[PDB]
Structure formats: C-alpha cells, structure tokens
Amino acid sequence: AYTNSFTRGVYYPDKVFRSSVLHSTQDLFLPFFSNVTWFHAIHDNPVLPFNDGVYFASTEKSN
Amino acid sequence: NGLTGTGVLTESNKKFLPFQQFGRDIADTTDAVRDPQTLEILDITPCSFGGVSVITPGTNTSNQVAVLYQDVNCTEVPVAIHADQLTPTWRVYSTGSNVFQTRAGCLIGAEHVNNSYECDIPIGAGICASYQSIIAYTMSLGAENSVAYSNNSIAIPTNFTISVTTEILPVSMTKTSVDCTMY
Amino acid sequence: ETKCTLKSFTVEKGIYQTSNFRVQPTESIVRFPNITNLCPFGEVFNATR
Amino acid sequence: ICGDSTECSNLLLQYGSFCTQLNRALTGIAVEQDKNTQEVFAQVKQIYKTPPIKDFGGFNFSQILPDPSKPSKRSFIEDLLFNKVTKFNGLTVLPPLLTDEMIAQYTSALLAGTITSGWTFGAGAALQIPFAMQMAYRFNGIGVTQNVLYENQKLIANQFNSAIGKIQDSLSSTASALGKLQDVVNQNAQALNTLVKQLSSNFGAISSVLNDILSRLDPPEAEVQIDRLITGRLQSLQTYVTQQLIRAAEIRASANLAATKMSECVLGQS
Amino acid sequence: ICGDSTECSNLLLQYGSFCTQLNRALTGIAVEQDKNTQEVFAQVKQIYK
Amino acid sequence: EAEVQIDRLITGRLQSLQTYVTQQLIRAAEIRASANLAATKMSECVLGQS
Ligand SMILES: *[C@@H]1O[C@H](CO)[C@@H](O[C@@H]2O[C@H](CO)[C@@H](O)[C@H](O)[C@H]2NC(C)=O)[C@H](O)[C@H]1NC(C)=O
Ligand SMILES: *[C@@H]1O[C@H](CO)[C@@H](O[C@@H]2O[C@H](CO)[C@@H](O)[C@H](O)[C@H]2NC(C)=O)[C@H](O)[C@H]1NC(C)=O
Ligand SMILES: *[C@@H]1O[C@H](CO)[C@@H](O[C@@H]2O[C@H](CO)[C@@H](O)[C@H](O)[C@H]2NC(C)=O)[C@H](O)[C@H]1NC(C)=O
Ligand SMILES: *[C@@H]1O[C@H](CO)[C@@H](O[C@@H]2O[C@H](CO)[C@@H](O)[C@H](O)[C@H]2NC(C)=O)[C@H](O)[C@H]1NC(C)=O
Ligand SMILES: *[C@@H]1O[C@H](CO)[C@@H](O)[C@H](O)[C@H]1NC(C)=O
Ligand SMILES: *[C@@H]1O[C@H](CO)[C@@H](O)[C@H](O)[C@H]1NC(C)=O
Ligand SMILES: *[C@@H]1O[C@H](CO)[C@@H](O)[C@H](O)[C@H]1NC(C)=O
Ligand SMILES: *[C@@H]1O[C@H](CO)[C@@H](O)[C@H](O)[C@H]1NC(C)=O
Ligand SMILES: *[C@@H]1O[C@H](CO)[C@@H](O)[C@H](O)[C@H]1NC(C)=O
C-alpha cells in the first residue's frame, strides 16, 4: 500500500533559538511528495531495513 | 557552560521553547543566553566603544582644544577616562568642563550658545563649533529676506558692474614606473 | 596626540581623528547547571577480572 | 580582526601599517560625499519666503509649496516620496552633516525664488515680476509669440492644474518608480552583510574563534593558525574597500551630473 | 579552479562565499551593458519610411 | 626553510604592489574625467560665448 506524503517530516535541526529569519540547512530529511508504505495490523509485522534513519506515522486510537 | 564571551548582561523579555539553550540573530552572534541554575533568559550587549576626535582652532591662534567622543552616552564618559586607560592625565577632562550631548556623541571643553551663525568647523547633525573660547551651536543657513511680490510691479536695474573670477582645474599627474626584479 | 599623529609641529584649524576607546571589563563569571556527580572509575580500576 | 587580543597586535605589527591607508581612504570618501551633497544643494546665498497672499494668475501651487502644519514642514509631494520608501561589531556608521530639515529649507527657498523673481536671482539679486509676464517671456523664448498666452491663460491654468493632479495621483498609486535609490541601498546593505558574515569562515584553520584556539594549543602551531586567519580576514577587508571605492566614484559622477542639471534647468532656461 | 574534483569543492567549502561574490559582478556588468545599448539607441516611438 | 621565508616575503611584496597599482588606476581615472571636463569648458567658453 502506497501513499503520497505531501509535506511532513521536518524537525528542528539544532537547539539554537532564532526569530523571523530564513535559514538554509543541508541535513537528513524526508523528501516532499514522497511515496510512503502503508501497513495493516490484521491477519502484519515484517522486518524492515533501517537505511540511515526512518520516519513513523501512527494514527491508532486504541492503546 | 563552555560558551565564553564579553559584554554586558541585561534582563530580556524574549520567550524560548523548553529545549533551546542560547539564541542568535545572524552571523553566529550569540545574543540570548539562559542561566542553567535559574532557567532565566538574559541578553548580551557588546561593551560600549567608539572613536575620539579633537577640535582645534589651529595652534597659531591658541592651544585650547575640545574633545569629541563618537556614539557614547554621558554615563559612560567618566568611567572610560579613568586613571588606567586613555591617558590617565585626561581624567581632569572627564569632568569640570561642561559636558554637551549631541546626536554625534558627546563633547567636552566647549560651551553651548543659543545663537546661530555661519560656522567653519563642521561637527555633524547640523551642529558645529568655532573659536569666536571654543563654542558650539547650530547651523544657520543664511540671512533671510522677503521679496515684496505684487501683480502689477517690476524691478529694473539701472547701473551695471563687471567683475573677474578665477577657477583652477588640474589636468595631469606625475608619470611613474616601477620594476619587478629590483623590487 | 594630534601633533604626534600628524607628524608636524604646527596644526591649522580643523577636526582630526586620533584613536578610539573601549570600556574594559570588570570581572569574570562562570556558571554550571546545578551540581556535580562522580562516575565510577573505581570499578574500572578495581575489578575481579 | 580578532577583538582585542594581544597576540593579534604582536603579529600585526610584523605586517606593516595597512590600517593606516584603509582608514585614510574611508575618511577621504566620507568627506568627499559630504562635500558632494553640500555643493549639490548649496546654490543660494539668502532665504526667500513666499508672500502669504497667493494669486499667481490662476495657477495653483498648494500641493507643491511647503505648509506650516506638519512637524517636519514638508510639502505633500515629498511626504508621499518619503512614505513610499521603506550593529556594533567593529564598525560604525557616521551621521550626515546636513539633516533633512536643511535640505527642505534649501528646496523651499529655491522654489520660492524661482516662482517669484523669475530667474534674475541667479545672477544678481531678486527682482519682482508677476507670473504671467514670466510665462510670456518663456513662450517668447521657446519661439512662440507672447500673443498666444494672453488669449489662453485660463486654458493653460486648467491644463496645469489637471496635469499636476494627475502626476500626484500617479505617484500615489503606481509603485516601482524609485528603482535607483532602492537598488543602491539594497546592494550596499548586501555588501555589508556579506562582509560581516565572512568573519565566521574557518579559512582553513581548525577553529573559527581566536580566543578559544589561543588557550587550548601549543604556541608554535598557534602562530601558524593565527597567520592563516589574519591573511584571510585581511584579504576580505581589501576586497570590501576596493568595492567601496568603485561605488563612491560612480556615485560622485552621477551627483555631478545631477548638480549640473539642477543648476541650469532651474535657475534659467535650456 | 576545481576541474571537476570533489576534493577541490571540499577544500573550498572552508574558504567562505567568495564564489557568489565573484559571480554577481559579471551579471551586473552584462545587465548594465544591455541597458546601455538600449538607452543609446532606443530614442523613437515609431518607425518611419 | 629559506624557500618558505622567500615565499612569505614575495607574497607580502606582491600584495603591496597590487594595492598600489589599484590605487593608481583609480586616481588616474578620476583625473582623466576632470581633464575631459576642463577641455570641454575651455573649448566652449574661450572660443565662443556661453
Ligand atoms: C544615557 O543614560 C541615561 C541614564 O543615566 C538615559 O536616561 C534614561 O532615558 C530613558 C529614555 O528617556 C528614561 O526612560 C530613563 O528614565 C532615563 N534614566 C535616567 C536615570 O534618567 C539616557 O537615555 C541615555 N542616553 C543614551 C543616548 O543612551
Ligand atoms: C492684481 O490683480 C487684481 C485682479 O486680478 C487687480 O484688481 C483687483 O481686483 C479684485 C477683483 O475685482 C478686487 O477685489 C481688488 O480690489 C483689486 N485690487 C487689488 C487686489 O489691489 C489688482 O489691481 C492687481 N494688482 C494688485 C497690486 O493687487
Ligand atoms: C489647489 O488644489 C488643492 C487640491 O484640491 C485645493 O485644496 C482643496 O481645498 C478645498 C477647500 O479648502 C478642500 O475642501 C480640499 O480638501 C482641498 N484638497 C486637498 C487635496 O487638500 C486648493 O483649494 C486649490 N487652490 C486653488 C487656489 O485653486
Ligand atoms: C485645445 O485643447 C484643449 C484641451 O486639450 C481644448 O480645451 C477643451 O476642449 C474640449 C473639447 O475640445 C472642451 O470640451 C473643453 O470645454 C475645453 N476646455 C476649455 C477649458 O476650454 C481646446 O478647446 C482646444 N482648442 C481648440 C481650438 O480646439
Ligand atoms: C509512487 O507511488 C505511485 C502509486 O503507487 C506510483 O504510481 C509511482 O510510480 C511511485 N513512484 C515512485 C518513485 O516510487
Ligand atoms: C538547583 O535547582 C533548584 C531547584 O530546581 C533551584 O532552586 C536552584 O536555584 C538550583 N541551583 C543551585 C542550587 O545552585
Ligand atoms: C597667525 O595668524 C595671524 C592672523 O593675522 C597671522 O598674522 C600670523 O602670521 C599667523 N602665524 C602663523 C605662525 O601662522
Ligand atoms: C537657551 O537655550 C537653553 C537650552 O540650552 C534654554 O533652556 C533657554 O530657555 C534658552 N534661552 C535662554 C534665554 O537661555
Ligand atoms: C582501587 O583500590 C585501591 C586499593 O587501596 C585504591 O587505593 C585505589 O584508589 C582504587 N582505585 C580507584 C579508581 O578507586
């Protein structure tokens, strides 16, 4: 199952405060409008490669 | 905690997210630091400094000179002319003389007058001084005259005088050359 | 100072720039977060094997 | 170069006295710019005041003359012009000698002089003359006989008022009409910004700050790193100074042209 | 000054932004040349025959 | 190490020479502009009327 990740996956690259300024940063990020794999927890949990970091989106209401 | 610097510490009103440690504005100029003991934010301001200049009427007329500190407040004047920096013997100039506050800094050794003339020693921001004791005042642009305008009158001259004026223009400089091996 | 900068024994009317001044710092301060804690070099330097 | 380090001075006195001619050039260009603006606007010897009674043959000069109702005593057009347009790290900016108020006073004096006394005040003294005969003199100058103006005074006045209203509206509404000044300000600010940002470059050393590197390493290689930093920063400073000199020369040329234009297209006729 | 070698780029990375500084001036020069020729010749609003 | 000393000396001297040449070029250009203005004024006012 494939899905289109529009613009998610941005994190504060550092612990430095700023205010009202454009900053350019080269770092590890999730490309925009990407293909994200979608998995179902019904009749699984397959082992997956790490490959230099990973994103994870969970939307499960039940604990 | 490792970040070292110099300046003056002031209270700050900025707000930080719970995970930053120090802030900056541009070009790696750290400006806001939070104290780890109390978790209170403080602001860094560079310690005051500036240039100094001397106003003199020429040693021929006399030898009394006024001093101008550029871009500094009055309160920083006495603490900057102390007996350990900037010619300790100038500490006497740090007081006594009527200190004057302008937009170009602070002036010491010159009086202030309410009049206005066409001066000859510019200072800045419309203020300039002259020897008359050295006195500093505001620029006076010139004498003001009102021409009586009326829609049925003229003014026609009756006598002409001719005059001669001089103008100087440079046209060339010295012709020079330089070698390489000899240098 | 003006004579020394201009390198002459006579100066005419005008305004000259000689040097600059900077306020000197008073003292030094240093802070560390709250406390100190000692990690066990003893077990590294004193172990059965 | 480093912010008050003794070793900096010790190594720099070994290099010469570059800062002397750097400061000399900067002071020279500052004084030159001051003289430039002074000679552009100082063209009169007295100050003329417009009479309170204003009947210029029907012409309306309300929106161009200054009025004593604003703190800055600035007219409508210059007010719109001002409204259209929109640190201590080792360098400073000096304030100009002539503030805006004196500039406005010169502009008002020149404008009143050229309205009232025609153009004779540019040679001798101010001599009265009604505006209509000045218009007739100008038409006679441009080759059209004075007979035309006196039969079309009202039409000319109406056209003048309509044109000045139209140009005021165009200035109020249209944008991007001040490309030159904005371009100059933006490029100067950008040059200063890149110069101040260059301070943080490593320049091939192992640290970008001198105070820390001084107190954490053996001196013998410390002088090597300090030399690298000094030569890099000096090169950047020289580049900035050269750029400033070029820009100052160009601005002087433009201001000289503007001064000539003001001198001959105002105090007379071309 | 690189000759298509990433070592040159890596070493230049520490030298600061001289690259853009030297890039912008030539563009400004070309722009003013274009404006200059356009100004010197474009002085009429129609074409007469 | 004499080679290193020579390299330092020559790079310093070349830096100074480059600075001097640039200053001379700028001053020469300004003087040229002034001389052109003077020639125009002399050719216009003296040989005619303004
Ligand atoms: C120089 O320092 C004095 C303080 O000694 C400043 O005076 C303050 O000015 C502000 C602004 O008007 C007032 O709110 C304060 O009450 C003043 N303090 C005192 C003690 O009077 C002055 O503004 C400073 N000047 C400059 C140029 O920095
Ligand atoms: C100036 O022009 C006016 C006419 O434009 C001349 O006559 C005035 O006319 C008005 C309107 O009829 C009357 O109210 C005034 O009493 C007239 N006399 C004035 C204003 O003095 C006038 O003679 C012309 N010259 C002067 C010096 O005003
Ligand atoms: C010149 O034109 C201005 C611009 O309209 C006139 O000023 C107007 O005056 C009236 C009457 O006082 C006001 O109601 C308007 O608001 C004014 N307009 C503006 C834009 O302020 C002025 O009266 C004209 N003068 C002459 C002699 O014609
Ligand atoms: C010359 O042109 C002006 C305007 O540019 C004319 O003045 C207006 O003309 C229009 C139509 O031609 C009339 O509706 C207006 O009433 C005129 N205004 C005034 C104040 O008269 C003028 O008529 C033209 N002259 C000739 C001879 O045609
Ligand atoms: C992304 O997913 C869509 C839908 O499955 C597919 O058509 C497309 O080829 C994929 N592109 C890439 C680069 O994986
Ligand atoms: C340590 O933490 C306590 C409580 O968080 C605080 O009151 C104190 O100011 C901190 N610093 C000290 C004790 O130096
Ligand atoms: C000083 O100025 C006076 C003014 O008249 C002049 O006579 C005198 O020669 C001057 N002296 C010097 C040394 O310049
Ligand atoms: C002169 O100027 C001072 C301010 O410097 C002002 O207080 C005073 O009222 C003015 N007039 C007189 C007569 O002193
Ligand atoms: C290890 O034990 C010896 C035994 O006396 C002691 O002297 C020494 O300080 C100990 N080392 C450490 C790191 O505690």
Curated annotation (Swiss-Prot), chain A:
Changing A41V: In strain: Eta/B.1.525, Omicron/BA.1. Glycans are attached at N35. Binds to host ACE2. RBD also interacts with the N-linked glycan on 'Asn-90' of ACE2. Cleavage of S generates a polybasic C-terminal sequence on S1 that binds to host Neuropilin-1 (NRP1) and Neuropilin-2 (NRP2) receptors. Interacts with host integrin alpha-5/beta-1 (ITGA5:ITGB1) and with ACE2 in complex with integrin alpha-5/beta-1 (ITGA5:ITGB1). May interact via cytoplasmic c-terminus with M protein. May interact (via N-terminus) with host bilirubin and biliverdin, thereby preventing antibody binding to the SARS-CoV-2 spike NTD via an allosteric mechanism. Attaches the virion to the cell membrane by interacting with host receptor, initiating the infection. The major receptor is host ACE2. When S2/S2' has been cleaved, binding to the receptor triggers direct fusion at the cell membrane. When S2/S2' has not been cleaved, binding to the receptor results in internalization of the virus by endocytosis using host TFRC and GRM2 and leading to fusion of the virion membrane with the host endosomal membrane. Alternatively, may use NRP1/NRP2 and integrin as entry receptors. This is Spike protein S1. It comes from Severe acute respiratory syndrome coronavirus 2. The gene is S. The chain holds residues 27 to 99 of 1273 of the full protein.
Curated annotation (Swiss-Prot), chain D:
Changing L214F: In strain: Omicron/BA.1. The record marks R74, S75 as: Cleavage. Disulfide bonds join C2-C8. Changing D183N: In strain: Delta/B.1.617.2, Mu/B.1.621. Residues 182-226 form a coiled coil. Changing N23K: In strain: Omicron/BA.1, Omicron/BA.2, Omicron/BA.2.12.1, Omicron/BA.2.75, Omicron/BA.4, Omicron/BA.5, Omicron/BQ.1.1, Omicron/XBB.1.5, Omicron/EG.5.1. Precursor of the fusion protein processed in the biosynthesis of the S protein and the formation of virus particle. Mediates fusion of the virion and cellular membranes by functioning as a class I viral fusion protein. Contains two viral fusion peptides that are unmasked after cleavage. The S2/S2' cleavage occurs during virus entry at the cell membrane by host TMPRSS2 or during endocytosis by host CSTL. This is Spike protein S2. It comes from Severe acute respiratory syndrome coronavirus 2. The gene is S. The chain holds residues 742 to 1037 of 1273 of the full protein.
